[PDB]
């Protein structure tokens with residue numbers, strides 16, 4: 001039925017008829033960045049004596 | 050692959066590409082004509098026995 005909708009006909013004669021495609025989607029969205037990172041001690045300004 | 054060459058993975062693109070009509074069908078039909086003739090070229094030169 002996909003072949004008949006590709007040809008826009010109801011009769012499909014003999015032969016290979018390249019139709020759709022075939023990709024294999026992913027699953028994991030594995031992201032990444034750097035181990036790094038200083039912090040800026042708000043702590044000091046939010047805890048001064 | 051017309052969709053994978055132009056858009057490339059993205060799926061928001063596929064709905065936009067459908068708005069240009071049958072340009073991707075024309076590319077597949079044109080290239081299939083070449084693909085079938087290239088095997089016939091070889092049969093006509095060598096398969097004479």
Ligand SMILES: *[C@@H]1O[C@H](CO)[C@@H](O[C@@H]2O[C@H](CO)[C@@H](O)[C@H](O)[C@H]2NC(C)=O)[C@H](O)[C@H]1NC(C)=O
Pocket residue numbers: 043047
């Ligand atoms: C705000 O400052 C106080 C004092 O410097 C911190 O209290 C210390 O907390 C650590 C771990 O919680 C303890 O090991 C220390 O003995 C504590 N010191 C004192 C004098 O109590 C408090 O943790 C600071 N706030 C934050 C969010 O770090």
